C-alpha cells in the first residue's frame, strides 16, 4: 500500500554516462588522423582509376558523314581513347551496304599495347532516359518466367503495347519494344599480320536473369511481335522463329533498366586470353537510328577496375575531404595560437 516511488538508477535518472568534450586537444588529432588515413586511400584510388585503358568511338552519323569507297579518317571530335601508349594512326571508318539496302558501318582502329586484363564491349547510348517512370516498370515478369498469360490477365503497365489486332502480344513491354539491335561482328577482325580475336556472347547478364528468364511455352498463332520487331521477324511468329528468351541473352541485358541517360549495356566479353596489339576492324549493322531518341550511340571497349572504369569521383571526394580537414585543423590551430580564447571564467555574463 506504500505509494513511495521506487529508488534505483533508472527511476531516478541516475544512470552512468559520459559527456563528450569538444576540446581542441580532442578535435585536432581526429581531423589530422582523418586526413592521414584519407590521403593514401585517395591516391591509391586515383592510381587504380588511372590504369583503366579503354576506348570509345561515336560511330553515329556513319550513314551520312562517312565515306563509301575508302576508309576516311574519323574526326577527333568523336574518337576518345586512354591507353598506356600514344596513338599513331587515326581511327577510320567506312560505309558498306549490301542487299535490301542493309547499310553497315565498318570501323577500324588500332590498339597500341597488349591488354593483359579481360576485355568488354558495350554500346553507350546518350539522352535515352531508361529511368523514366513510364519506362522502367512497363514490363510483365510472368511472361518472362514463361507462362501462357491470357489477354485479360496481361500486365496493366504495358498498356499501349498490349494485344495488337486482337492478338496477344508476346513481349508486352516498352523495354522489349525499343531494343538496341545493332548486331556486332562478335569478333575483332585483325588486319595486317594480326589474327582475329573471338569474343563470348553469352554469360553476360545477371545470374538471376538467366535463372528467371525461362523459355516460353506459347504456340505460334496467338502471339505477335511488337511493332519494332516486324522487320527481323516478318509474317508474325512461327514454330521455328519463336525466340527463346533463356538463350537470347541480349534481351536479358536490355531489360535491366539503367540509372542515368549516360549508361552502358554489356554486349560482348572475353575473359580467356589477352588482346594483342595491332589494327582491328569491327562491323556494325546500322539498324538503330539516332534520330529516334535524339542522342548519340557509341561503341565502347573497356577492361575492368577494382572500383569501376575510368572514373575519379571517389578519389576527388577523398581529396576534398582530406583538404577540408587539413585546412580547418591548421586554421583552428593558428587561431588558438595567435589569439587564444582566454574566456574559461564565467565572469557573471548572465
Amino acid at each position: 500500500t506504500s505509494k513511495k516511488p521506487p529508488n534505483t538508477a533508472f527511476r531516478q535518472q541516475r544512470l552512468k554516462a559520459w559527456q563528450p568534450i569538444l576540446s581542441p586537444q580532442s578535435v585536432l588529432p581526429l581531423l589530422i588522423f582523418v586526413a592521414c588515413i584519407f590521403t593514401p586511400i585517395g591516391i591509391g584510388l586515383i592510381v587504380s582509376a588511372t590504369k583503366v585503358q579503354d576506348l570509345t568511338i561515336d560511330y553515329s552519323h556513319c550513314d551520312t558523314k562517312a565515306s563509301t569507297t575508302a576508309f576516311e579518317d574519323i574526326p577527333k571530335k568523336y574518337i576518345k581513347y586512354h591507353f598506356k601508349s600514344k596513338v599513331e594512326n587515326k581511327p577510320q571508318w567506312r560505309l558498306t551496304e549490301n542487299e535490301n539496302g542493309e547499310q553497315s558501318c565498318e570501323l577500324q582502329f588500332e590498339i597500341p599495347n597488349d591488354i593483359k586484363k579481360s576485355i568488354f564491349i558495350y554500346y553507350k547510348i546518350t539522352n535515352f532516359y531508361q529511368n523514366h517512370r513510364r519506362y522502367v516498370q512497363s514490363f510483365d515478369t510472368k511472361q518472362i518466367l514463361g507462362e501462357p498469360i491470357k489477354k485479360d490477365d496481361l500486365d496493366t503497365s504495358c498498356s499501349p503495347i498490349r494485344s495488337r489486332e486482337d492478338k496477344i502480344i508476346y513481349p508486352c513491354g516498352l523495354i522489349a519494344n525499343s531494343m538496341f539491335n545493332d548486331t556486332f561482328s562478335q569478333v575483332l577482325s585483325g588486319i595486317d599480320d594480326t589474327e582475329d580475336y573471338n569474343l563470348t556472347n553469352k554469360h553476360i547478364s545477371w545470374s538471376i536473369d538467366r535463372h528467371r528468364f525461362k523459355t516460353t511455352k506459347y504456340n505460334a498463332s496467338d502471339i505477335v511481335p511488337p511493332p519494332n520487331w516486324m522487320k527481323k521477324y516478318p509474317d508474325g511468329y512461327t514454330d521455328e522463329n519463336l525466340p527463346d528468351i533463356h538463350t537470347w541473352e541480349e534481351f536479358q541485358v536490355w531489360m535491366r533498366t539503367a540509372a542515368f541517360p549516360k549508361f552502358y549495356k554489356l554486349t560482348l566479353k572475353n575473359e580467356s586470353a589477352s588482346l594483342p596489339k595491332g589494327k582491328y576492324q569491327m562491323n556494325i549493322e546500322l539498324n538503330y537510328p539516332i534520330s529516334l531518341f535524339g542522342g548519340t550511340k557509341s561503341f565502347v571497349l573497356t577492361t575492368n577496375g577494382a572500383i569501376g572504369g575510368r572514373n575519379m569521383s571517389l578519389g576527388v571526394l577523398y581529396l576534398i575531404v582530406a583538404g577540408l580537414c587539413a585546412l580547418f585543423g591548421i586554421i583552428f590551430l593558428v587561431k588558438l595560437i595567435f589569439q587564444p580564447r582566454a574566456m574559461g571564467d564565467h565572469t557573471y555574463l548572465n
Binding site: F120, T156, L292, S313, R341
Partner: protein, 1064 residues
Amino acid sequence: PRVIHINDSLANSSFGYSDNHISTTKYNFATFLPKFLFQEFSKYANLFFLCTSAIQQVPHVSPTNRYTTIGTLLVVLIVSAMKECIEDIKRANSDKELNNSTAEIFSEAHDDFVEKRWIDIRVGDIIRVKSEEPIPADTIILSSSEPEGLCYIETANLDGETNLKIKQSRVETAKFIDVKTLKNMNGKVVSEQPNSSLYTYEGTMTLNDRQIPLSPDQMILRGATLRNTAWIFGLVIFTGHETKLLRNATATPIKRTAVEKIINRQIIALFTVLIVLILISSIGNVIMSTADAKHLSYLYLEGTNKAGLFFKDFLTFWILFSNLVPISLFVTVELIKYYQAFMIGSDLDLYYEKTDTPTVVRTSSLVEELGQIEYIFSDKTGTLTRNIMEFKSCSIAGHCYIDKIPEDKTATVEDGIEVGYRKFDDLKKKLNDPSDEDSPIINDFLTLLATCHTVIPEFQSDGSIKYQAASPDEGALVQGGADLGYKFIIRKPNSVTVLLEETGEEKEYQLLNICEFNSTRKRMSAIFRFPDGSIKLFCKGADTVILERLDDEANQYVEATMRHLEDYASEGLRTLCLAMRDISEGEYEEWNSIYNEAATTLDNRAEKLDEAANLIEKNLILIGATAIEDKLQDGVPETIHTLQEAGIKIWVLTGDRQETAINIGMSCRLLSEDMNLLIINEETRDDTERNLLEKINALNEHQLSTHDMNTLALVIDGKSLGFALEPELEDYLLTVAKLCKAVICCRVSPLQKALVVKMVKRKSSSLLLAIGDGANDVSMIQAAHVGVGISGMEGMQAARSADIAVGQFKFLKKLLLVHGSWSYQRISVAILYSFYKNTALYMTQFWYVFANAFSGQSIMESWTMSFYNLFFTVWPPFVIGVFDQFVSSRLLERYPQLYKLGQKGQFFSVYIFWGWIINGFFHSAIVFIGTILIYRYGFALNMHGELADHWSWGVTVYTTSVIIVLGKAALVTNQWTKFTLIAIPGSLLFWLIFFPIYASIFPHANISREYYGVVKHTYGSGVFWLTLIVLPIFALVRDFLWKYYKRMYEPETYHVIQEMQKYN
C-alpha cells in the same frame, strides 16, 4: 411526477430507471471505431495522409506500391488505439474498484438489511448507511439514530463550503427506528425530475394516509459525507448519472501551448515548400515534354491532350513528395511527453514522507511549459505556511501572557498603560485566589476558550483525547486550554462538559444557541445558560468589526488591548477578540421569537438569520484577545529566493491586512531591507487613479539604473486592487506591475484571484503558474496555464483538479528549474531532429527529377522508404527526448539564470527550424551529387563486367542517408548513457543485418521483386563500403566544425556551465 414506491423493487423497475454504475471510460468494446476514427482524423497530418492514400488509388499515377502510405498510417493508428485502450483499461480498473464496494439494502423477504454491491442498488430501495460513511446515492431520509431525526452531511464535493449541514428528517416519519417494523409502511413518493440545481428540491412523500412535502432540507447528494451519526435510513430516488451533482458533469477544455502553435507554423511552412517543389517539378516536366516531344517518341506519349497529363504529373509528384510531413512526429512527441509525465511522479525528491503523497501529473499536454514561467500567483495560508495553528499569546484585562518570555522585553516598563510580557505562572497565580477583581474576567475568558467553539472531542483507548475541530485555530485554542489546565471533554447535544483541573471537579454549561460562522459577519456568537441560571452571550471575531459595537464608557482597558493587537500585528500573528454580556430572559425570549421568525423563512436564510442575530449583538463587553501562530513551511525562504534570483516575478496574495502581509513578506525573504514599497491604499476610485498616475509619472520621468530596475516591489490592498482592475484602469496596474520584482496583494477576495489571473494572462505574453490550496481558489487553477495543487489538510479538492499535485512548496525549486529546463530543451531538439531526418531523405526524390526527364521516378524501393519511419529512425528521437541531460541536475539549481534561456525561447524558434531544414536540403543535395558522380555509367562493379541497375543505386542512397542521419543524431546527443548505444548504432546494426535477410527471403513471395540479386551487387561490390565512408564524413564535417566553433570561440552561458561540469 416521479412516482417512487417505498418497499417493492419489482414495482419501480417497471418504470425502468437508471442503474448505479458509473461510466468513466472514454471508449468501449461496442462503439469504438466510429468515434476513434473521427477523433484521430481531426488534426493536419492524419487528414493529409488519408487524402494522399485516397488519391493513390488511381491507376498509372502511383510511383511506388499501392500500399506504401496506408501501412504507416494504419500502424500509427493502431498504436494510438492501443494506447487509448490501455488508458481506458487503467481507468476502468479504478472504476470497478470504486463500484464493487459494499452497501446495505433492505429485503422484504428477509425483513432485514442484506449486504450487497453498490451496482445492485435500484431507485426506491431503503438503505442503511453506517458510521461516518458517505451516502451512496440521492436519498431522502426516513429515520436516523439521532432522537429527533437529524444528521450532519459534509458538502465539500458539491460545494466548496467546509462546514457541515444539518439535514433532518420529518417528525411524522422518524418513528421508524427498528428494522423489523420497516415492512408496515406503505405509500409513494412523488419526486421531481432529475436536475442539476443542487440547492432546490421539490417532492411529495405520501405516508400511510396523507402526503408530506419535500424540500432540499432533506435532500442528500452523492458527493456529501455522513458525519457524527451512527447510521441513517435513506430512500434512493436518483442514481448513477441521474443524480443532481453528476448529471451534466463539467468537461476540461483543450489546453494548448505555444509550442503547439510553433509546430503549426512549421507545418504550414512545410506545406508551402511542398507546394513550391511540386509546382517547380511539374513545370519542369511540362516544359521538357513540350520541348523534346520529337526525341521522346519511343515512350509513346500522349501529346494530343496535355491538360490531363499535367494533372496526372501533379498527382504523381504529390504522391511522391507527400512523405515530407512525417506523421511519426505526432506520436513520437506524444509518447515523449507521456514518458516525461511518468518520469516526474517517479522522483523521491518530489515525494512527501510525512503524508505519503508523490507527484501526480494528471495532464501531460503541459509539461514543457514548466520551462517558461514568469509569474507565480502563490497563496499564503496552506501554501507558504504549514496550515497548523498554535496558541502562543493571550492578552486579557489589559495584561499579556506568554510561557517562553524572551529577554528583550521581559522587563515590563510600566510606561503608564502596562505593555510587556509576563509568564503563565503569574496568570495561574492571579487565577487561583478568588479575591482578585480580574479573576472573574480571567475565568470568563478561559470558559470562552473551552465553550464558545464547536469542537467535538473523542476519547481513545490510550486516553489521549482527540479533538475534531472544523478550523485548526479553534482546535489549537482547545488544546491550549487543555494543556493550560482547562481540559475540554465529552460534548453531548445541547450541553458542554468541562473538566476543571484547578479544583478537580467536572463542571457543565447548558448550550442554548450558537450562530454559525459567516464570511460576511466574520463573527461567531453563542448564547449560553449557566449553573447560575444566568444567561450569558459569548462572541468572537476580528478587531475591525466588534470594536465598533462596544460600550467604551464601561471598560477601561481598550487601549491596552489595541496596543497588544498592534504589537501582535507587527509580528503577523492572527488574532481574535473575545466579548461577552449578561442578558435577561425577556430579551432572550424575544430573540427566540426573532429566531423563529427566521425559522419561518426557509426561502431566505442568508439575509434573515445573520442580521436577525445582529439585533442582539448591538453591545458587548470586551474580555481581551488571543494570538494563534502559524508556522512557516521548510525551504520556503530558500525556494522563493532562488526563484527570484532566476528572474521570476512572484505575486503573493494574502487574505489579511497590509502590515501583516508586509511582515510575512519580510520574514519569508520575499522583499528586502531596501526594497521600494509602492504602497497604494486609497478608497476613492478617482483618488486611486490619481495615485496610479502620480506613481507612473514619478517612475517614468527618471532613468532606471541596474540597481533601480531590480529593487522595486508593489504592495496593494483589496479595495485598491478591486478598483484597479476595471477595463479602463487595468492597463495602468499592468504597466506598473511589470516594472517591480515582487507583488503583494492584501485582503484579496476569493473570487478575485481568478480575475487577476485572467487579467494578467489576457494582456501579456508570459505563462503563469497558479499554486494554492482548498476549494476557495479552485477557480485560480482552472483558469491559469500551469495549475499546481498542494495536498493539504484543507481538503483534497485542489489536488484532484490541478495539472500537477505537489506535496509542498519546497518541491517547486526542482519542478521549474530541472523538470522545466529539461522538459523544454528535450522536446525542441526531438521535433527538430524528426523534421531533419525526414527532409534529408525524402528530398532526393526532388533532386532526381533533373535526371529522369522530370518523370517522377522513385529512387529507392517502396517498402524500404516506409520502413524508414518505423524500424530505423524511432529510437534515437526517444533517447534524445527522454534519456538525455544537457546539464546535471546538481549544477542546475546552483545557477538558476539558465532558466532565462527557457524563459525567452532560445532553443526553439522558426529560425532554427529553417536552419535545420536547409541543412537537410544541403545534405540531400550532397549525397545525391556524390552518388551520381560515382554511379556515372553504372560501370562500378568488378563481377565479370556486369553492371549496376536502378535499384542497386537507390539502396546505396538509402544506406548513406540513414548513416548520415544516425551520425547527426550521435553528434546532437549530450550524454552517452547505456540506452543510447541501442538507439543510434543499434539502428545501424539492425539495418545492416535486416537488409540481406529481407532481400533474400521476401522477393521469393512476389512482394519485393526489385531485390533479385542485389545482395551480390551491393555487398560484393567494392563501391558500397567506400561510399559509405567517404560520403557521411563529407556531409557531417560542416556540422562538426560549426559545433566546435560555437563551443570554443563563441560560447554561451550553458556552454560555460557544461564546461565547468565536465572539468569540475
